[PDB]
Amino acid sequence: ARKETYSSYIYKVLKQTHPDTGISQKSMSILNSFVNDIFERIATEASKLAAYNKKSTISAREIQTAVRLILPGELAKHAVSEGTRAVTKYSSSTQA
Amino acid sequence: QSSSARAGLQFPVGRIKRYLKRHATGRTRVGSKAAIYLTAVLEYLTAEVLELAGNAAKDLKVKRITPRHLQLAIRGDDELDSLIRATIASGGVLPHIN
């Protein structure tokens, strides 16, 4: 009677990308299975190549490498653009 | 007294202790089931390397060279589905025709 779920952040980001539509339960389960298995394979090869580089701590360069080597080139240039952009944003952690 | 022999059989256990530690995830691993990793590696490497004795009448050659072990790893249909997409360096193909 206690379960971690993914659907909440999913429906808020669906409503913010596109404004005005609805969702469905089995389609909720197919895209949350999609998000956890894409995390699953980035995580497995992230640990694998942070193992074989003989380096000891997981790092952002390492996972930018990871996301480059797992997903094809169109979303490679996308995901690296907002990888650098997100680290620009959270790296900019000031008082204002 | 010695762990491979206090086990008894003929693979080392003390390195696969920390080679499982090298690879593990679950933050905890037992100190007594090194006793099965050596059994796994014993069985699978003997269950390939003893078949290399089938070189004899087809090679009359005393070492276990690189085409030749795959040249008899093929007809182990029970074997080839354990190195499935895996393929040799300079191994050859078991020949056949139409």
Partner: protein, 97 residues
């Protein structure tokens, strides 16, 4: 000069090569091949001999797999040549990309 029928001589050359296990493509040809395909999309980098040897090993193994099952797809159609539609049907049955 007596040389008889062609075609079963194809079969003895068949058995001639697949008895042997020599690395069948030529060396400095693949050397210049892999440099002049690598240097362009990512910049000037250097190679090592065992790594490049292993990567044309990969190239040989993959393409020999694809042409043997291309041969099977060709002899599906009751026919003995090799033609392009066999090749692209082989590429498509093999998981397009």
């Amino acid at each position: 000069p007596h040389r008889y029928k062609p075609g079963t001589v194809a079969l003895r050359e068949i058995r001639r090569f697949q008895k042997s296990t020599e690395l069948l493509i030529r060396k400095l040809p693949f050397q210049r091949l892999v440099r002049e395909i690598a240097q362009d999309f990512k910049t000037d980098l250097r190679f090592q001999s065992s790594a490049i040897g292993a990567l044309q090993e990969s190239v040989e193994a993959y393409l020999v797999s694809l042409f043997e099952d291309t041969n099977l797809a060709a002899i599906h159609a009751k026919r003995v040549t090799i033609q392009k539609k066999d090749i692209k049907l082989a590429r498509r049955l093999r998981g397009e990309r």
